[PDB]
Amino acid sequence: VWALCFMGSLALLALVCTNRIQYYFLYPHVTKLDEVAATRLTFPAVTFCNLNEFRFSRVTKNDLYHAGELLALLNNRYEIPDTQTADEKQLEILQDKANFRNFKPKPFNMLEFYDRAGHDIREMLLSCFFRGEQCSPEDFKVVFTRYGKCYTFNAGQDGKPRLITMKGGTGNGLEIMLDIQQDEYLPVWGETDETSFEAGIKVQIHSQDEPPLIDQLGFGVAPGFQTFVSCQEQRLIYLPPPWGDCKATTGDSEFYDTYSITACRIDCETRYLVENCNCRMVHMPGDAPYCTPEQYKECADPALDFLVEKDNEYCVCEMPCNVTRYGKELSMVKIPSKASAKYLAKKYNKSEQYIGENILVLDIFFEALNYETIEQKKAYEVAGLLGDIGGQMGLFIGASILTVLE
Amino acid sequence: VWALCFMGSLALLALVCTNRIQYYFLYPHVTKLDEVAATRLTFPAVTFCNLNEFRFSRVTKNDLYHAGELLALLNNRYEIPDTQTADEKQLEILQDKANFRNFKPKPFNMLEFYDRAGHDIREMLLSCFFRGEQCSPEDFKVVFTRYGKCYTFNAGQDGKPRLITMKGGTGNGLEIMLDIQQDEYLPVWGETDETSFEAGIKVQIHSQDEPPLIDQLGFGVAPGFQTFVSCQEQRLIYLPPPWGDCKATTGDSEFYDTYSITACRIDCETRYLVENCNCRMVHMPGDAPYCTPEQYKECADPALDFLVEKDNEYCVCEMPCNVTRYGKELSMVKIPSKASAKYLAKKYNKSEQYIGENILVLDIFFEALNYETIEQKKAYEVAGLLGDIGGQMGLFIGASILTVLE
Amino acid sequence: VWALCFMGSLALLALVCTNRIQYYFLYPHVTKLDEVAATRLTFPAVTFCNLNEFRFSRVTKNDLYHAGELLALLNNRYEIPDTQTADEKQLEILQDKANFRNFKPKPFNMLEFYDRAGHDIREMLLSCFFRGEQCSPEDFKVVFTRYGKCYTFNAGQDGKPRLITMKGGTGNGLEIMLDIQQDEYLPVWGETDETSFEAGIKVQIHSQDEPPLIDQLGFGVAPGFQTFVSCQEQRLIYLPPPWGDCKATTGDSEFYDTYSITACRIDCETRYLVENCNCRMVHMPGDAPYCTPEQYKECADPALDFLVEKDNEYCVCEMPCNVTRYGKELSMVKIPSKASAKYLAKKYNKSEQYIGENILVLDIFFEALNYETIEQKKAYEVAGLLGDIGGQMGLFIGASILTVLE
């Protein structure tokens, strides 16, 4: 008599049991977030670039011939544009070296042009301090970006015993004072991908083993300010194939020997430009010929402009399994003060005007809670499934012992 | 003999079993946080407002009569305040149209005043680019806030095939150059909720289907800078009644057909002002009469000033079950450079002074890890409880088989 | 016959069972993150400091004698440095009170010097508003930092019924307008830890019961801007000994009666300076003698400079079990506008130049989602282990009933 709903007690097992086994096959994960004060923490690499690509005093006669149009300094008939914009003192200088009567074109490449005309760390870096220790231009590695000759502090390449951070605050990080040298900025007479309307620098904080994409990803620092950048290192760990679609951390993709989102982007930005312009830009890796100024203006610029703005399809990247993110909070105070302008003016052999317009202090450091791990953890292991459907079996063929008793 | 602590083995079951069943009734939840590089991602809406509400050249004789006191331009006896502050060239203009001898008041409402005197996108927008494509004032929807005539890029209303983002960097987002038109700013002679001491604009990044609250929630952008806004879309999902107290996402509340915190706030800001001033402000929805300048100064301003600063009680909102947050990291570089000022001066038919004081470049884009889900997941399902108290029952009436054996 | 792999079915139990018991001993935890719109939320404390330590008009003859070298105003032979930098009008004033012929040294201590020469809230605070209510210098508590005489709004010490926040937006928070008084800045003739090249203020948002470390942790606010600081309170809860190594929240460590990272840092910064200079700095607690200017320059500065930049070893802190973090997003607009400069100039009895160079508006408020809890939760309780190894036992000595049946 009392056994009709005992096979109905089998119906309860089925419904409850069949969902815990479906839940496993969804392969669900939870998140383990730990914000903590670390010790012996590795300091990131800091890349920076002047927003002006070429120093006006270094642009030679041959430099202007090959690259003039690309820099919007010459029209098509190799002369100064009909318009343009002043300048009483500069137009004298430029038209003198725009005189091509007497001139025969000499060999030219953009990498050497960037390298020589590009702004120099040795005259930009007025002051460097990391953790009490004073750094020099030696502590900065030259790296080429779409901006030109750029510089990486703490690149930590070749034997260099990487710099560590212990606690929070400005003192436990990097401080640099810079002269952006506005009096060396190329006159802007038109708009091209090489000229800008802005004075200042671009900065990007990244892992030593991930290349910069400062054109796209970087932050700006304005001249005539001290800028505080309070940071936090975020370690993001993901789960392999069955739970999430991450690509393996330890390589292995193309021109760089560490897989990251940025490396993957530059990888096929190189492929794309080679497969379309027969040409690579200055900042791209590989061994293809460097783009000639004519190829930059006709092919290489629009090609990369297409990839970084229009493309929805060609250069897309998978998620790596390890990602380092840098949370940052920015802040400014004015430099110089009325009470200090004259000091710095004298100290660096400069006008008081100049100091207010060119001088810049950068502070990169971490806050107290400097380290964050965001790791995806498995929610239902195989053993926990068996221990749940097992203890589910012995509940309707094991806890029936107390219902038939009553 | 060996059965005295077997009912003491029942005591172990009770203590361990009664806490796993209490743990279920706490209804606990965990968090699933996923920061990832997305694809086919929806671009937010961008609302912006000039901090000056009314263009000085558009304030007519009738405009000054009705709204003069509210704008701190006239005292109570309809004349220019006894003090005030200059200006040799402006006081000539204002006192000419402050001459009310010969004048008879004409019909007036604030919405039309805002609409006509309000700053115009067509003369503010000097440059617009989204993802390589150039935008025009057509791509901006006019929206009224407490600031006045404001504008929303990518409002995505009425058929408009919403704009998408693929990757990280400035190129995959919006860039706009603006003239805030300081020479059109109303003279500030006193302090009111309509005048400000600041030049610049207010910006707010929000969902297409959530209204702006830019007065309260927005960020500022200063003139004479290029400002980079690196973003991250954060999707926050919460749990319904038993686990958390969220209100349903899909409606359904009052003047807007999507429930959000901002919509809920404006909802009863409208109710409150109607139920206290017999009046609605220009930016509020519904069908009540628009506030007259006199009602603004006497009733509507203090009423809303009470709600947004003092009120602890009247207009409080429940959490929605879906929230879109935008993490943002701001950055500046100077505009113009010494080497480009003259170009832009000529390009827009303006003084070099003007360019340094009025011109502004805004960049809104997402970083590489553009998308974040913060979803609350159930920690103890009903099936996992049964599989644990079941496997708990068969441990003291099932693993006694190995203790009586020894 | 059908019993050879039944002891092989014992092998399955062993492998699956021995990992769920190893998983427990790893003591794993998950994370519960809840971003929500709060109510009745406690407003933080806001500390700020002028970047100039000593007001030029308050530096007396005796002040210059004792502290002159430390301030880089005097060389070693008690005279004005041979160089230095101007100033036609200031060098007249300073050399008059640098005349020590006729002068006999009087008693001196840095705390009184900071207290008297330090910038005064009563002449810096031009405007204060919190949630519609106007605040005065009374609402600001004087606190000494390495900057000098600094000020804390909403310190909430001694009976003060702490201020609350309800919703998001500028209105539900603090707004302050400041004159940093650049015309009162001490001339900078050299570089010391007491002089700076920057005009502006340092700000830090912290818990009422945690001291400031504004030198290290604070953010800057530049003069001639309105700065918006959109905030979010983050409550971080950690797990005691067995799961994580947190130190107890409710005390109990040294000079402050609440354990926090900042309190712990100042604790042994005090110990260190006492145990090395026989000396404490002005901002440090305890009862040791205050450092004399000579001791500052010779001992106390380099000692603390060592701790905040070089030290990897001496002053390291454990994690507390409760931490309050403040996420912040910064933003600027220009002050004053061309149309308002003259008003403020007149209002505060100042030059139009002065207003552009000294005036500053600060806005501290929370966004809509103002409150965040990041709490570490236990992943495998003891009861859930037993209910899993129990339901694991009764799966190979309980679900064999269906395999021997077939």
Ligand SMILES: [Cl-]
């Ligand atoms: Cl790409």
Ligand SMILES: [Cl-]
């Ligand atoms: Cl409200």
Ligand SMILES: [Cl-]
């Ligand atoms: Cl320390």
Ligand SMILES: [Cs+]
């Ligand atoms: Cs450009």
Ligand SMILES: [Cs+]
């Ligand atoms: Cs490789």
Ligand SMILES: [Cs+]
């Ligand atoms: Cs206002």
Ligand SMILES: [Cs+]
């Ligand atoms: Cs509705």
Ligand SMILES: [Cs+]
């Ligand atoms: Cs200093």
Ligand SMILES: [Cs+]
């Ligand atoms: Cs204590």
Ligand SMILES: [Cs+]
């Ligand atoms: Cs379980």
Ligand SMILES: [Cs+]
């Ligand atoms: Cs279980």
